Protein backbone atom coordinates (compact mmCIF):
# COMPACT_ATOMS: atom_id res chain seq x y z
CA UNK A 1 0.00 0.00 0.00
CA UNK A 2 1.00 3.65 -0.58
CA UNK A 3 3.88 4.32 -2.96
CA UNK A 4 4.22 8.04 -2.44
CA UNK A 5 7.62 9.71 -2.78
CA UNK A 6 9.75 8.62 0.18
CA UNK A 7 11.77 10.58 2.75
CA UNK A 8 10.72 14.09 1.67
CA UNK A 9 13.40 16.40 3.06
CA UNK A 10 14.08 20.14 3.36
CA UNK A 11 17.75 20.04 2.36
CA UNK A 12 18.58 23.75 2.47
CA UNK A 13 16.72 27.05 2.63
CA UNK A 14 17.28 30.73 1.80
CA UNK A 15 15.05 33.80 2.14
CA UNK A 16 13.55 33.12 -1.30
CA UNK A 17 14.01 29.41 -1.95
CA UNK A 18 14.19 25.86 -0.68
CA UNK A 19 16.00 22.73 -1.90
CA UNK A 20 13.66 19.79 -1.41
CA UNK A 21 14.63 16.14 -1.90
CA UNK A 22 13.01 12.68 -1.85
CA UNK A 23 13.52 9.05 -2.89
CA UNK A 24 11.29 7.58 -5.59
CA UNK A 25 9.02 4.72 -4.43
CA UNK A 26 9.32 1.07 -5.45
CA UNK A 27 6.76 1.38 -8.26
CA UNK A 28 7.71 3.07 -11.54
CA UNK A 29 6.40 6.63 -11.82
CA UNK A 30 5.77 8.60 -15.00
CA UNK A 31 6.31 11.87 -13.16
CA UNK A 32 6.26 13.74 -9.86
CA UNK A 33 3.55 16.30 -9.23
CA UNK A 34 4.86 18.94 -6.84
CA UNK A 35 2.71 21.67 -5.30
CA UNK A 36 3.57 24.38 -2.80
CA UNK A 37 2.03 27.40 -1.14
CA UNK A 38 2.03 29.40 2.08
CA UNK A 39 0.86 27.18 4.92
CA UNK A 40 -2.77 27.98 5.68
CA UNK A 41 -2.71 30.62 2.96
CA UNK A 42 -6.04 30.99 1.17
CA UNK A 43 -4.14 31.62 -2.06
CA UNK A 44 -3.59 29.51 -5.23
CA UNK A 45 -1.02 26.78 -4.72
CA UNK A 46 1.80 26.64 -7.28
CA UNK A 47 2.06 23.28 -9.03
CA UNK A 48 4.94 21.82 -11.02
CA UNK A 49 5.20 18.51 -12.86
CA UNK A 50 8.69 17.00 -12.87
CA UNK A 51 10.33 14.09 -14.71
CA UNK A 52 9.67 10.95 -12.66
CA UNK A 53 13.45 10.49 -12.52
CA UNK A 54 14.01 13.72 -10.56
CA UNK A 55 14.86 13.31 -6.88
CA UNK A 56 15.34 17.02 -6.07
CA UNK A 57 13.80 20.39 -6.82
CA UNK A 58 14.65 23.95 -5.86
CA UNK A 59 11.60 26.06 -5.11
CA UNK A 60 12.24 29.73 -5.84
CA UNK A 61 10.33 33.02 -5.96
CA UNK A 62 9.20 32.65 -2.35
CA UNK A 63 8.71 35.34 0.31
CA UNK A 64 11.28 35.51 3.16
CA UNK A 65 10.44 34.40 6.73
CA UNK A 66 7.37 32.64 5.38
CA UNK A 67 5.87 29.24 6.22
CA UNK A 68 5.32 26.98 3.20
CA UNK A 69 3.82 23.54 2.59
CA UNK A 70 5.27 21.39 -0.18
CA UNK A 71 3.30 18.38 -1.38
CA UNK A 72 4.40 15.59 -3.71
CA UNK A 73 2.36 13.02 -5.64
CA UNK A 74 3.71 10.16 -7.72
CA UNK A 75 1.89 10.03 -11.05
CA UNK A 76 2.02 6.44 -12.30
CA UNK A 77 -0.74 6.46 -14.90
CA UNK A 78 -1.10 7.91 -18.39
CA UNK A 79 -3.71 10.20 -19.92
CA UNK A 80 -5.15 13.56 -18.89
CA UNK A 81 -6.41 12.02 -15.64
CA UNK A 82 -3.49 9.64 -14.70
CA UNK A 83 -3.43 7.38 -11.63
CA UNK A 84 -1.76 9.18 -8.72
CA UNK A 85 -0.32 8.32 -5.31
CA UNK A 86 -1.68 9.78 -2.08
CA UNK A 87 -0.02 13.07 -1.03
CA UNK A 88 3.26 13.41 0.88
CA UNK A 89 4.20 16.81 2.32
CA UNK A 90 6.56 18.75 4.56
CA UNK A 91 6.58 22.28 5.92
CA UNK A 92 9.45 24.70 6.32
CA UNK A 93 10.06 28.40 6.70
CA UNK A 94 12.31 30.49 4.46
CA UNK A 95 15.03 32.58 6.10
CA UNK A 96 14.17 36.25 6.75
Beta strand residue intervals within the chain, DSSP E: 6-13, 17-23, 31-38, 46-51, 56-60, 67-75, 88-93
How far is the C-alpha of 24 from the C-alpha of 6, rounded, in Å? 6
Residue 14 sits at φ, ψ, to 5 deg, of -130, -175
* Residue (47 or 95) nearer to its own copies, CB: 95
Least CB distance from residue 11 to its own copies, whole Å?
5
Least CB distance from residue 22 to its own copies, whole Å?
9
Least CB distance from residue 44 to its own copies, whole Å?
19
Binding site for its own copies (CB under 8 A): 7-13, 39-40, 67, 69, 90-93, 95
* Residue (22 or 29) nearer to its own copies, CB: 22
Amino acid sequence: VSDVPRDIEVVAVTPTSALISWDAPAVTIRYIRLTYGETGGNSPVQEITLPGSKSTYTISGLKPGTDYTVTLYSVTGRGDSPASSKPASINFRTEI
